[PDB]
Structures are given as structure tokens and as C-alpha cells.
């Protein structure tokens, strides 16, 4: 059907924030198909070719002082500015995670109970999920599916714990997240 | 590091497709509808706390296209190499019979940014309530994309996310069913 060759051009301006507005780094990147050809790193202060293909542009743009002056001031007028515009609903967006504990629908072991700690619908993504057995943090046997970004400003993750359950034992899943002042806990009574 | 804001744009020939969007820590803040010439916020709430001059994205896209053609010529018309997407289907929360949920079709690590996605319920196309995001940037310069299907779980239904991309020899079907 359609076999014509494609040609792609991408331009990315990345503003990197450390300790909020304290330290800011601007990274301007030009990508042809899948290769970055030229970039402006505010830490360098000028355009630099990433590949042979970008040399003419790095040279040409660096000969335009107005341009460089503008790009050098962008960490303030662009990056710090946009950070201020969205901070109230980006940097400070908070959505508490829903937490539940249940046995895995799959138990591939003998006298072993694989426990699942499901943590979903939260924001931001930084989160800490840890298991405990009678107040003692479980190191080994733990396995996570990793942080899953849903594309709608929410995350989810499953953190399993293999166990050799004995009546009376209390297995706790602890969740620390910026949305709550104190850890969220869900216990499994074995 | 703590946070990253990205203004990402692209133009693709010969499809003539273009995109302009802002990203915060991997999530889309907004993109610009090139045809309606207006800002489309990822979440409705955003449009009440901030604004953006959409017509300005169009100025950039015109420069992007001009530059694409200069680069195409400068590379002796080296076309892009297709890279097929990794496709994954998941729910946005633990599934429970008869309790409303959402099927998420995650299309990741691919290029060029042109894909055809279809949801199938028992082998039949579904167009009810589905939604999708635009193409999202990746550090390796490939793309990501999300397609959504709100549904009511039941052991009676089976689903498939059908993905087509030039990097794939055949349409890819990612199946999902209760359990």
C-alpha cells in the first residue's frame, strides 16, 4: 500500500529543575529521524553539533549573538517562568493512592503464599512501598512490577512478597507518598 | 534531579503530520490542535489555572517543516528506520467483576509517530467511549502513546488491542480477559 520512505524532524526544549528553581538546566535538541544532530546546553552556553549532520547549524547559530543571548537567558525567561506557571498543579499535584492486599491469583509454590500489595491511582510518581513481617522489614522475596505511568497523571504498581505463613503472623504493606503525612498501612493476617 | 518540563514538537513527511506539546515529568500538560488552532489540555482542570497562545505553536511547526526539508536534502534523503512498538494492555486498577474500570493499551518505543489502533470486544470493533493521547516524547527519541477503553468486567467478554505500524509485518493483537 503505502511504502514511501518517511523523514522525521523533532525539536525538544527540556528544562531540568533541581531543588525547584534553585538550579536550572536548559537543553535544546534537534533530532533528524532517530539521531540528535545538534543541541544547546545551557551548561555549555553555545550550540554544539552532536553529529556531522548538525555542524553547519551549530556554526551558523553560534554566529548569531542575539540568538545566543536569548538562549542563555531562557533558563530564566522560559524555564523558571514556566515552572512558576504550573507549579500549583504539577509540582504540587497530589492524589492519594488506593491500597489493597490480597493473595496472588497465582501461587506457584508449596506451602507458600505469594502476597500482592496493589497501589494505584496516585500522583506524583515518587512512592515507597515496603513489606513487614511482625514489624520487621522484609528484604528478600520482594518483587515489584515497577512504577507504571498511566498517561492520565496517575500511577500504579504491584509489590509482591513471597511468604511461608504461620497462623498469627501479621504481614504489613507500608506506603509512603507525598499525598499523606503518615504512612498508609494494610495488613494481611495469616 | 527532581523535575523536567519538555516542549516537544515534530513534523513528518510525507504524511504531513505535525505536533506540538508540553510534557511534565512524562505526563502531557497540553498539545495544540493544528486544525482548530487551539490548545487542548490533558486534564480539563489545567485550562482553568493556565493558558497558552496556540497560534504560536503554528509558527514553530512551519519552521520545523522547512527545517525537515533542509535536513532531508542534507542527508541525501536518508529515510527513517521503522521501529515496531512494544504493546501492553492493562487496567488502571485491580479488576473486579461488574465494577467499572479502564483498559489501557500502552504503545511504546516506536517510530515514526504514525500508528493505527483498534479495540476489539469478542473480535468486534469498539468505538464506545474510547479515547487516546497524542504522541509522547521519549529520551531515546522514539515515541509512546496511550489508548483507553472504559469497560465493565465480566468473564463473558474478551478484549484485544489491535496495533498497526510499518515496523510490524502484521497487525499486533494484545489480548486481555478477566484473569
Amino acid at each position: 500500500g503505502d511504502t514511501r520512505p518517511r523523514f522525521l524532524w523533532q525539536l525538544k526544549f527540556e528544562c531540568h529543575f533541581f531543588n525547584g528553581t534553585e538550579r536550572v538546566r536548559l537543553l535544546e535538541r534537534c533530532i533528524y529521524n532517530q539521531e540528535e544532530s545538534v543541541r544547546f546546553d545551557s551548561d555549555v552556553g553555545e550550540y554544539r553539533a552532536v553529529t556531522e549532520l548538525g555542524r553547519p547549524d551549530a556554526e551558523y547559530w553560534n554566529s548569531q549573538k542575539d540568538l545566543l543571548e536569548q538562549r542563555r537567558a531562557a533558563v530564566d525567561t522560559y524555564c523558571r517562568h514556566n515552572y512558576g506557571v504550573g507549579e500549583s498543579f504539577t509540582v504540587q499535584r497530589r492524589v492519594e493512592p488506593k491500597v489493597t492486599v490480597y493473595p496472588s491469583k497465582t501461587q506457584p509454590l508449596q506451602h507458600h503464599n505469594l502476597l500482592v500489595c496493589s497501589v494505584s491511582g496516585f500522583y506524583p510518581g515518587s512512592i515507597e512501598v515496603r513489606w513487614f513481617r511482625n514489624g520487621q522489614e522484609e528484604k528478600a522475596g520482594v518483587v515489584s512490577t515497577g512504577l507504571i505511568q498511566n498517561g492520565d497523571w496517575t500511577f500504579q504498581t504491584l509489590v509482591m512478597l513471597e511468604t511461608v505463613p504461620r497462623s498469627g503472623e501479621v504481614y504489613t504493606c507500608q506506603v509512603e507518598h507525598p499525598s499523606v503525612t503518615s504512612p498508609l498501612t494494610v495488613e494481611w493476617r495469616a | 534531579e527532581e523535575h523536567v518540563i519538555i516542549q516537544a514538537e515534530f513534523y513528518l513527511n510525507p504524511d504531513q503530520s505535525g505536533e506540538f506539546m508540553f510534557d511534565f515529568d512524562g505526563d502531557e500538560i497540553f498539545h495544540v490542535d493544528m486544525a482548530k488552532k487551539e490548545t487542548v489540555w490533558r486534564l480539563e482542570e489545567f485550562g482553568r489555572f493556565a493558558s497558552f497562545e496556540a497560534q504560536g505553536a503554528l509558527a514553530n511547526i512551519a519552521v520545523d517543516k522547512a527545517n525537515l526539508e533542509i535536513m532531508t536534502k542534507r542527508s541525501n534523503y536518508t529515510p527513517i528506520t521503522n521501529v515496531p512498538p512494544e504493546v501492553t494492555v492493562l487496567t488502571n486498577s485491580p479488576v473486579e467483576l461488574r465494577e467499572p474500570n479502564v483498559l489501557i493499551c500502552f504503545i511504546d518505543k516506536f517510530t515514526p509517530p504514525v500508528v493505527n489502533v483498534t479495540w476489539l470486544r469478542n473480535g468486534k470493533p469498539v468505538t464506545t467511549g474510547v479515547s487516546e493521547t497524542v504522541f509522547l516524547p521519549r529520551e531515546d527519541h522514539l515515541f509512546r502513546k496511550f489508548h483507553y477503553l472504559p469497560f465493565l468486567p465480566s468473564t463473558e467478554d474478551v478484549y484485544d488491542c489491535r496495533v498497526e505500524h510499518w515496523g510490524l509485518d502484521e497487525p499486533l493483537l494484545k489480548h486481555w480477559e478477566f484473569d
Binding site: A74, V85 | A50, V63
Partner: peptide, 13 residues
Amino acid sequence: PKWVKQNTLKLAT
């Protein structure tokens, strides 16, 4: 608050 965009520059022809 209004987000601002960075302007794209023409490449060397």
C-alpha cells in the same frame, strides 16, 4: 499564568 514557548530557528540552507 501563561506558558511561553521557545521559538524554533531556521537551519542553515
